[PDB]
Symmetry: C2
Subunit: 202 residues, 2 copies
């Protein structure tokens, strides 16, 4: 069976409390993430050879896929990729920026504090559903950008280092309309070691 | 004071229970709707003469507004218009389709049941944040379409008859990911008399 799979949550559903509630983690992972994978797999039944692409390859080739599934794949491979990434980039363990990522952040933003302010603002200003991202060019240059819906920096040949889901389903149960509190709290669970790995893998 | 105003909710905050929860009505009206109006007003301080436009006029002229506020107005006048419309198009009173609207629905969709199935499906398939609409051309022809974010049929010279908010903030507290249940329940609170007025005002 070479269909796409939901990656099991890498920690307990209540591991990110009190920053993200257990109920949200259950819905977010077991309903939302699950639905993107299911829909992706269903769309691909017509072209089974596409099961042999990685999520990245699908996302890097949206404009050359068969016209009749291009949009579905964009949305659902996007959802599948983004959520796998998002759950991996959070952790109950305490982590901090180190090594080349730590240096790159200081270099490209001036300081970690300045980077964090810019990131929070970009995340706050996303209008509608979307994501805020710290991304790297192939040469390791860092910047912050956002994508709408389940669109991914990957489709623009940018490499995601960290990323924050600001779809309302990611924060509404606990924060309601207060996305700023969500964004601020989320920095307590960012997995900086996983971010470092993402940056090294360029 | 000719600034744009939040229209007070036309019924009690718990009037739509058990279809829409009181907590959501409070947040939706007092936080979300309120924020669109505030942001609209703030953007317009630079061009105070625009306070003399109606919401419709702003939305019908997004492409000719001064470049530096066009997007903000699109988003926030859209939010202000859509929500005023949405709260008006729901009611605790029992209503049903009648007169010319009732006839138009049968004419353009075959039956009320067929219209409802198509509407529910369009609302279910909105990807990301958006709205489903029953709209009329100037000659009274009916169709169903959707807009993303706070975009409005008004900007395409279509007249909204009824419309459903499918931003996740509109249903997440009570329905979580189960948008289908939200959509199905919402038909119990649709104000068909207000819809008739909307259709007559062509
Ligand atoms: Mn999500
Ligand atoms: Mn809304």
């Amino acid at each position: 069976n070479n269909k796409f799979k939901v990656k099991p949550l890498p920690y307990a559903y209540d591991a990110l409390e009190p920053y993200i509630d257990k109920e949200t983690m259950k819905l977010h992972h077991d309903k939302h993430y699950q639905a993107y994978v299911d829909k992706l797999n269903a769309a691909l039944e017509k072209y089974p050879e596409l099961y042999n692409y990685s999520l990245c390859e699908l996302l890097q080739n949206l404009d050359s896929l068969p016209k009749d599934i291009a949009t579905t794949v964009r949305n659902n491979a996007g959802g599948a990729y983004n959520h796998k990434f998002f759950f991996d980039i959070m952790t109950p363990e305490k982590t901090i920026p180190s090594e080349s990522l730590k240096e790159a952040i200081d270099r490209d933003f001036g300081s970690f504090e300045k980077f964090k302010q810019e990131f929070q603002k970009s995340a706050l200003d996303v209008f509608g559903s979307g994501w805020a991202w710290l991304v790297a060019t192939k040469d390791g240059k860092l910047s912050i950008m956002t994508t709408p819906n389940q669109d991914s920096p990957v489709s623009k040949n940018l490499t995601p280092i960290i990323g924050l889901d600001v779809w309302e389903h990611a924060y509404y149960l606990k924060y309601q309309n207060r996305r700023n509190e969500y964004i601020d709290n989320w920095f307590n669970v960012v997995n900086w070691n996983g971010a470092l790995e993402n940056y090294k893998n360029l």
